[PDB]
Ligand binder design. Sequence first.
Ligand SMILES: Nc1nc2c(ncn2[C@H]2C[C@H](O)[C@@H](COP(=O)(O)NP(=O)(O)OP(=O)(O)O)O2)c(=O)[nH]1
Ligand SMILES: [Mg+2]
Ligand SMILES: [Mg+2]
Length: 430
Amino acid sequence: GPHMATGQDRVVALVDMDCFFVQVEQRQNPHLRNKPCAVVQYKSWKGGGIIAVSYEARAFGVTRSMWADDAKKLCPDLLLAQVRESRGKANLTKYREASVEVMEIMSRFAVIERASIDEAYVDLTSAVQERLQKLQGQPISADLLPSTYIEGLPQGPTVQKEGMRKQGLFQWLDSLQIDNLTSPDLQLTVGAVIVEEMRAAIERETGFQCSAGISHNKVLAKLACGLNKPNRQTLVSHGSVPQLFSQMPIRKIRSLGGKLGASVIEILGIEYMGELTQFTESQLQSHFGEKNGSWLYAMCRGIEHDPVKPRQLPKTIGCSKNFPGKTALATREQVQWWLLQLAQELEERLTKDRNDNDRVATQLVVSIRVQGDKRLSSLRRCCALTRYDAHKMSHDAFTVIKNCNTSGIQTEWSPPLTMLFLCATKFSAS
DNA sequence: ATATGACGCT
DNA sequence: AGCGTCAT
Ligand SMILES: Nc1nc2c(ncn2[C@H]2C[C@H](O)[C@@H](COP(=O)(O)NP(=O)(O)OP(=O)(O)O)O2)c(=O)[nH]1
Ligand SMILES: [Mg+2]
Ligand SMILES: [Mg+2]
C-alpha cells in the first residue's frame, strides 16, 4: 500500500516531428507550404510510393504507402516532392541532415535517445528537479504552457478546441499542489514547461514544427504525443491512465501493434489496455513469457521501466533496395553492379560518419531476399569491414552470398533476388 | 510493386 | 551467428 509502486519516478518526453519529410521539402520550396503535399519515392510505377503526407493532404485521405497516382485521385491538387535518387536508389541524406539539426537542439536541454529519424525520447527528471528550486515555490502560469493539452481534462461541472484546451489546463493548474517538489503531477507540469521551450527553440532555429508527449515513461509519452498532433504537446498523468486505457485498443501501445498484441487479444478475449488489470502477473507470464507477462502487468497500470538510453547516433548504417516483381535481379552481372551501387553510398556515409562522430564500423552484414519469400530477409551473412572501400565491400558481400546461387549456368542468377541490403555495424571509437 | 533502424530469441 | 519481431 505505502509500498505500492506507481511508476512516477521519472519525467520522460517523446518529441516527434510533424510530417517530417514534407516539412523538410516545404522549408526548401516555399511554394509547397500550407498546401496538400506529399513526399514520394521513385516515379515510374504508379507515380511513386508516398512516405509522408502534409495535414492538408491527409484531410483528403492521402496516406503513407499510397501510390502517388492513386493519391492524385483523392486529391487532384496534391503537390509532390520526390526523394533524391542517387545511383538508382533512394538517397535520404537531406532528411538525415535535417534530423541532426533537430537532435542537436534537443540535446541542449537534456539527455536524448534517438528513436527514429524524426523522434527522440528525453529524460527530464534532472532538469525538472533543478528547475523546481530555481522557481522557488512560485506558481506555474498557464502562459508558460501555450500549446499543452492535459489529457482527461476538462471534466466535471465552449464549442472550440482552443477553449477546451485552456479550460482543462486551468483545472489542472488550479488543482496543482507544490507538494514538497515531490508531487509527480508537479514534476510533469514543469517537464511540460521545458518541452514548450525545447519545441519553441526547434521551430525558431529550424522552421520545423513538432508534437510531444510528456509522462512518466516512454510508452505513455509516445502515446501522449499522438493524441494532439500536429504542433501541440500532451501531458498524460499517472491519474489519467485508468480512463485513458479503458477504451484504448491494445494495438496502440508500443510493441503491441503486431503478433504479441494479437495473441493478447485472442488468448485473453479482450480489446482494451485496461482489461489487462484483471489478470495476475503469473497468469500473464504463463500466457506470454516471464518478460512479456511482467511488462504487461505493470504497463496496463501505466508503469514501465525502459530507460531513456543516452544515444544520439544510430548504431548501424545501412542501405537497401528492393527489386520487386519483374525487376528481380537474374544475372551475376546485375547482382554485382547493384552491390557496388549500394557499397558506394555506404562508403560515403561511413566516411562522413567517421569524420563527424569519431568511430569506425568493423562488421559488414549482407542481407538478400529471393523471389517467392514473404520475409524481409531471406538470408543474412556477415564479414569483416576493414576498409571503407566500395569495391572491397561489394566484392566481399558478393563472396558471402555467391554460394546462394543455385544456377547451373554461370552468368545467370537463380532464384532471382528481390532485395539487397548492406549494413555496417559493430562500431569502435576512432 | 508499402528504406532502413533497434532489438529479442536461440 | 543467424533468424524473427516491431517500428518509422
Ligand atoms: N523510406 C521510408 N521513409 C518513411 C517510411 N515511413 C515513414 N518514413 C519517413 C518519412 C516520415 O516523415 C518520417 C517520420 O515518420 P513518422 O513520424 O511516422 N510520420 P511523419 O513524421 O511524416 O508524420 P506525423 O509524425 O506528423 O504523423 O520517416 C517508409 O516506410 N519508408
Ligand atoms: Mg513524425
Ligand atoms: Mg516518427
